Amino acid sequence: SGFRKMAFPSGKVEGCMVQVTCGTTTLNGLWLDDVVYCPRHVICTSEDMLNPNYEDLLIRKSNHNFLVQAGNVQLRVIGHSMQNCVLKLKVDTANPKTPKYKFVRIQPGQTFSVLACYNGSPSGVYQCAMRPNFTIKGSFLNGSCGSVGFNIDYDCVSFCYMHHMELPTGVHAGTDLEGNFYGPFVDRQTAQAAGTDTTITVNVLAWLYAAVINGDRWFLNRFTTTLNDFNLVAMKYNYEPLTQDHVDILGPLSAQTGIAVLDMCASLKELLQNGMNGRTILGSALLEDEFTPFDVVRQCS
Amino acid sequence: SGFRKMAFPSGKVEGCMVQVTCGTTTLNGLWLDDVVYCPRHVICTSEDMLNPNYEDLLIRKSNHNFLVQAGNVQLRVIGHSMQNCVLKLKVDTANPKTPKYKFVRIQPGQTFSVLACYNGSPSGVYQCAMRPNFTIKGSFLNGSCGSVGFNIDYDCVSFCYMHHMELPTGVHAGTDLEGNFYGPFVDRQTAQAAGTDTTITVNVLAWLYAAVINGDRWFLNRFTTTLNDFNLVAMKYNYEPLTQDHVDILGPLSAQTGIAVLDMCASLKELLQNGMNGRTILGSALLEDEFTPFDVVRQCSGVTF
Ligand SMILES: O=c1[nH]cc(-c2cc(-c3cc(Cl)c(F)c(OCc4ccccc4Cl)c3)c(=O)n(-c3cccnc3)c2)c(=O)[nH]1
C-alpha cells in the first residue's frame, strides 16, 4: 500500500551522461553508441542569443572546438551535424554502457523521469509530466541543459525529452531527441510565453480511481453526468476537456473498481465545487494530475 | 529554478539488488562483496510467522535451502548467519559492481531515497523521510521486502534502511543494515501500531526557505520570535521542538536568502495559528516536512555526485 510519485531507476541513463564545452559554454550531452546528443545553443555566445544563425555558426566550427568529457576521459570528436535544435557529435569510441533505447515523442499529459545533471554529473532524479501548454515544471539550474527525460520499459530506455531552456515564468522548455521542440518555442532569447496551463483531467480521474483502489471512498457520490455537461463545468476550473478517447483509456480502472467513468466524473465535479474540507486523498490536499492511467495500474494492486 | 521532491540517482544501488527465495517466499537481497543481506523473516512459513523462533528456524536450515538469483546468474551460498533482524548469506563470488559504501543509522526527520524492487529487479525510486514515530510513508506492494534506502555523499553510498513489513494502517517499518529496527516493532505477524506522528519542524522551515528562494514569499511577516516562544505554540500543534542545533543548520539558507531564521519561525508560527488563506506554497496546500535543510541546499545550488 501507499502511493508516491515514483521515478524510474536512473542507472541506465547515468551511464550515458557526458559534459560538452564550446568556448565558455558548458552543458550536458547524451552519449549513445558513437554519437553525443546535446542542445545546439552550446555553440552560441551570449551575443548570439537574440538572433542566432545556427547554420552559419556551425559551419565555422571544427571538430576540435568541441571538448567532450566522459568522466576523466576526453572523447575525440570526429564529426558533427545538426538535426533541428539538437547537435549530433560523432565520437571515435562507442559508449560501452549504452542501453537498449529508442527516441519517442510524447503527448501532453504523459509523464517521465528527469535525470538532472551538471557538468556531465547526475544531481538527482524526479518524476515529471508534460503540461498541456507543452512546458514542464522541472527543477533546473544553470548548467542543466542537456539533461534528459525518459521512461523505462522492461529494459529499454525511451528518451522523450532533452532540456534546453527556462522561460521567464520559471517553467521549462525542451525538445524530443530529434531536436523538435515541444510547443511553440524556439531556442533564442526572444519574447515567448506558454499558453495558459490547465489541469490534466484524465490524469486526475486516474488518480481518483487509485484512491478508491487504496480504500478512500469519502468523495464518491450518487450522481452521474454526461460527458458534455462535465466538460462544460470542468473547463470553468481551467481543466482540460475530456475526450471519448480519455474515457476509453479509463476503461480498465472503471472495471477494476466497479465505478463508471462518468460516475467518477460526477465526483470530480463535486470536489471542484466543495474542495477537500480539511481532508486529503492519497496524502494530498490538492487534486494530483501527474499520474497517468498507465502509471496508476503500474504502482497499484 | 523549480523545486521537486528529488531522489538520489540510483545507479550505484541498482547493481546490488538480487533475488532471494526460501521455500515459497521470494524477496530482495542486497549483494555487497560476497555477502547478500535480506530480512531474516524469509525463513518463516505460514505457521512460523505467528510466533517465530528465528535461531531454531536458522539452525534447521542449511546453505542449499537459500536460492539466490543475480539476474539470470545463480549465486552459490557457502555460509549463512544472522545479525539482529537481518540475514547474511555468504556467496562464492563477490559482486563486481559493489560500490563504495557504508552502513549508517539515521535519525527521525532525516530523508533518504528508496529503491523499491520486486524479484530482485529495481522498479522505482522515491524520496521519503524517517518519521518521528519511526515509520516511513512508502509505497510497497507484496514482494518489496528487502528494498533498501540510501544516501549518496560524494561517491559513497550510505545504506540506512531495509524494508521489512507493512503496518495495518498502510505505513512501513524496517531496520538499518545491521538489522536493528527503527521504532518499537518486531518481525512477527502480530497486532502492532505506530505511535502518533508529528511534523518535522526544521524541515518545514527549510521548505519555506526553498519557497522564498523560488520567489514565493507572501507568508513572510515583520515579526521575529524566540525558540522558547515558538516551541510553546509548536508543541500545541504536534510539531517537533526546535533546538539551537536546528537554527545553526539553517544558517546557509538564511544567508543565501536574507531572511534570518528567527524571522522565518515567526512566519511558520503564524501559518500554524491561522493556516493559509486560499494560498499555496510551491504549489502545495500542506506544509511540507520531507525536505531537510541539506536537501534544499543541494537542490537549490546544483550539488552533483
Ligand atoms: O554555459 C551555459 N550557458 C547557458 C546555459 C543556459 C542557457 C539557457 C537559455 C538557452 C536559450 Cl537558447 C535561451 F534562448 C535562453 O533564454 C531564456 C529567455 C529569456 C528571456 C526571454 C525568453 C527566454 Cl527563452 C536561455 C537556459 O535557460 N539555461 C537554464 C537556466 C536555468 C534552468 N534551466 C536552463 C541555461 C547553460 O546551461 N550553460
Side-chain angles (χ1 to χ4, degrees), chain A residues 1 4 11 14 139-140 166 299, chain B residues 1 11 14 137 139-140 166:
Chain A
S1 192
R4 313 282 310 208
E14 297 173 43
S139 175
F140 279 135
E166 188 178 293
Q299 186 169 173
Chain B
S1 50
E14 298 173 50
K137 315 203 70 181
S139 175
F140 298 109
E166 177 170 284

Side-chain angles (χ1 to χ4, degrees), chain B residues 1-46 48-60 62-63 65-75 77-153 155-276 278-305:
Chain B
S1 50
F3 202 72
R4 278 275 183 182
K5 193 161 289 173
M6 193 177 288
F8 287 102
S10 64
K12 297 180 161 174
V13 174
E14 298 173 50
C16 305
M17 300 312 299
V18 301
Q19 189 190 248
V20 166
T21 294
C22 213
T24 79
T25 291
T26 306
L27 46 62
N28 308 281
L30 186 65
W31 182 20
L32 307 167
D33 292 320
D34 60 350
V35 181
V36 175
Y37 306 80
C38 74
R40 79 174 170 177
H41 76 68
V42 67
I43 73 184
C44 294
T45 70
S46 317
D48 285 328
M49 272 178 199
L50 291 55
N51 182 31
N53 173 1
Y54 281 109
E55 54 197 2
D56 190 62
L57 284 46
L58 188 57
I59 288 317
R60 319 310 216 197
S62 48
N63 284 341
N65 293 117
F66 296 106
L67 201 175
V68 169
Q69 221 92 30
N72 280 125
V73 191
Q74 188 166 345
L75 289 325
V77 184
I78 53 173
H80 54 297
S81 66
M82 224 178 57
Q83 188 190 342
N84 294 318
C85 295
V86 153
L87 188 69
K88 292 196 271 190
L89 293 182
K90 195 172 191 54
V91 288
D92 67 61
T93 33
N95 189 2
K97 299 169 179 173
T98 304
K100 178 79 194 116
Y101 79 96
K102 74 195 76 71
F103 289 169
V104 307
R105 192 169 174 86
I106 60 174
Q107 311 272 20
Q110 291 180 290
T111 55
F112 53 96
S113 296
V114 168
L115 187 60
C117 311
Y118 297 88
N119 301 118
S121 166
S123 155
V125 66
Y126 57 85
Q127 183 78 353
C128 59
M130 178 67 65
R131 306 301 312 173
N133 71 359
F134 292 105
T135 63
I136 84 180
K137 315 203 70 181
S139 175
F140 298 109
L141 301 184
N142 191 33
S144 60
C145 297
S147 301
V148 295
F150 64 102
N151 289 276
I152 300 183
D153 190 298
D155 57 316
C156 184
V157 187
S158 278
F159 297 99
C160 59
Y161 179 85
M162 180 171 285
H163 180 54
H164 286 239
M165 60 198 200
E166 177 170 284
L167 285 169
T169 59
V171 302
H172 302 104
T175 65
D176 63 26
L177 267 293
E178 296 169 53
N180 306 288
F181 254 97
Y182 290 99
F185 307 112
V186 293
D187 43 358
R188 181 215 322 174
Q189 178 158 6
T190 193
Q192 325 178 52
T196 284
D197 200 21
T198 49
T199 297
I200 314 162
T201 304
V202 62
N203 288 4
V204 176
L205 295 169
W207 177 74
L208 291 178
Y209 278 110
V212 167
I213 291 168
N214 277 270
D216 223 4
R217 59 161 55 215
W218 63 262
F219 49 81
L220 297 170
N221 56 38
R222 68 178 66 244
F223 315 105
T224 287
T225 184
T226 56
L227 279 296
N228 179 82
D229 217 310
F230 174 80
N231 273 327
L232 295 178
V233 180
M235 308 195 183
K236 299 198 181 175
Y237 291 88
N238 267 21
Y239 265 67
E240 283 294 314
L242 205 66
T243 81
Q244 187 61 41
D245 208 359
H246 295 161
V247 176
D248 316 336
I249 300 157
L250 295 164
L253 296 175
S254 168
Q256 155 161 1
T257 214
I259 307 316
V261 164
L262 296 165
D263 175 13
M264 188 68 88
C265 304
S267 288
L268 174 52
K269 187 172 166 163
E270 281 307 303
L271 297 165
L272 299 181
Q273 305 168 331
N274 296 268
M276 316 182 224
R279 318 171 198 242
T280 61
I281 296 170
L282 285 174
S284 170
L286 307 170
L287 290 185
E288 282 290 323
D289 74 355
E290 301 220 336
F291 298 91
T292 69
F294 288 39
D295 290 340
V296 179
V297 167
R298 143 201 166 265
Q299 181 172 169
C300 297
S301 85
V303 166
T304 54
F305 314 95

